[PDB]
């Protein structure tokens, strides 16, 4: 058992049929010593008598708010949450696996640039009795400072017969060095509580690995002489790091109507020449030129 926050404790339960659970001793936070009784949650059945209560925690039914009373009045609260482990695996019910990039990816973080600002996302089908808590830092031994905002609902879509809710957090490294070569990774740690079910998640990454520039800016076309060719032109996105002579980008351009495996062409220049067809569209992405991080989304125009 360990303290999560003031008067809130977590019990680690390795559950299986006929498991014994964990023996937990609670102590009423009082100078008094006699005439003390104990309850659980909102029931008025007395469970024990004395300044200390010993319980065998072996299910969620044994968790909740234990309260001690003396002389008909309340003295102290203690809320027990459970971190359920089953066959050597911590529960992960609250968050949904996004499976991008890797399996077992519950927190997904991206950065629009090297400034040190990044955003993490996660998914849940729960809408009530849900609490999150997010801290972050660079390095684990002597950690540097990373301040994060509050997690809030950002989106909400459909997942068959369930609504899927999306939370997000803005984070910023206290002292960033956009040009430097990172040696220690960012650590993001999220605690989640749903009713009496505690869980936590983690994510490690270098900014350079999670970088996803915004789509190319000001994408435009213009006809050429004779043959049905077009000149595609675009610019760097505003959110991208600056100067652009130092933080260079690569671009991918493709035609696609409606087996367009050959329509793609790559270039470091900010415009290209392509061939258009009826009702086909031209679209372009952007990627860091010198480090194969993530591609941006598409920026498209009709032919």
């Amino acid at each position, epitope marked *: 058992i360990w303290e999560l926050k003031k008067d809130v404790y977590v019990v680690e339960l390795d*559950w*299986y*049929p006929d498991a014994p659970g964990e023996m937990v001793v609670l102590t009423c936070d009082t100078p008094e010593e006699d005439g003390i009784t104990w309850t659980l*949650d909102q029931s008025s059945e007395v469970l024990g008598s004395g300044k200390t209560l010993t319980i065998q925690v072996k*299910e*969620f*039914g044994d968790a909740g708010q234990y309260t001690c009373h003396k002389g008909g009045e309340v003295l102290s609260h203690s809320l027990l949450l459970l971190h359920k482990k*089953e066959d050597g695996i911590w529960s992960t*019910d609250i968050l949904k696996d996004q499976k991008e990039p890797k399996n077992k990816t519950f927190l997904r973080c991206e950065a629009k640039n090297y400034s040190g600002r990044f955003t993490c996302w996660w998914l849940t*089908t*729960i809408s009530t009795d849900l609490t999150f808590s997010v801290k972050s830092s660079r390095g684990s031994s002597d950690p540097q400072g990373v301040t994060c905002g509050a997690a809030t609902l950002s989106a909400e879509r459909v997942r068959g*017969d*369930n609504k899927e809710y999306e939370y997000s957090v803005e984070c910023q490294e206290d002292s960033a060095c956009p040009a430097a070569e990172e040696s220690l990774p960012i650590e993001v740690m999220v605690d989640a509580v*749903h*009713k*009496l*079910k505690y869980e936590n998640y983690t994510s490690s990454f270098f900014i350079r690995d999670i970088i996803k520039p915004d789509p190319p800016k000001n994408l435009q076309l213009k006809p050429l002489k004779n043959s049905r060719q077009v000149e595609v032109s675009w610019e760097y996105p505003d959110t991208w790091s600056t100067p652009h002579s130092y933080f260079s980008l690569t671009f991918c351009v493709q035609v696609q109507g409606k087996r367009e495996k050959k329509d793609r062409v790559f270039t470091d220049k900010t415009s290209a020449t392509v061939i258009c067809r009826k009702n086909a569209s031209i679209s372009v992405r952007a990627q860091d030129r010198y480090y194969s991080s993530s591609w941006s989304e598409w920026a498209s125009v009709p032919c």
Partner: nanobody, 123 residues
Framework: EVQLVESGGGLVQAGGSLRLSCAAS????????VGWFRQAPGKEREFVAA????????YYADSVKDRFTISRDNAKNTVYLQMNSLRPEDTAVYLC????????????????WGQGTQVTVSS
């Protein structure tokens, strides 16, 4: 809103056996679980057994493990309670409920309930 409907109850004689069923309209969460409670006359409803839709070992009450076995059928979306070797002390209303905190024996942790089916065992 999930809906739960019990059935299979009735009047059997000591040593007999019934199979109750709890037909659910769906699942609040992928990890939701369905549990059987039993409400004898005069007393409060006591936990019997519970099982997750996603499988794994169920969670039985201290005693019933030998006589009672709980099973599921994801296709029909129904949970079964096979009761064997019944005694007159088993007479009660058998209710079924859905929970998001498997394993749990506490009623207040089950968010949705059926109206229950009557089981009467006569010596």
């Amino acid at each position: 809103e999930v809906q739960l409907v019990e059935s299979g109850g009735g009047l059997v004689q000591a040593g007999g056996s019934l199979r109750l069923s709890c037909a659910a309209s769906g699942r609040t969460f992928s990890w939701s679980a369905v549990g059987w409670f039993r409400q004898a006359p005069g007393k409060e409803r006591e936990f019997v057994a519970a099982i997750r839709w996603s499988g794994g070992s169920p969670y039985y009450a201290d005693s019933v493990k030998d006589r009672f076995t709980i099973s599921r059928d994801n296709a029909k979306n129904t949970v079964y309670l096979q009761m064997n070797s019944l005694r007159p002390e088993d007479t009660a209303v058998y209710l079924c409920g859905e929970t998001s905190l498997f394993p749990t024996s506490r009623g207040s942790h089950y968010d949705t309930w059926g109206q229950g089916t009557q089981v009467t065992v006569s010596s």
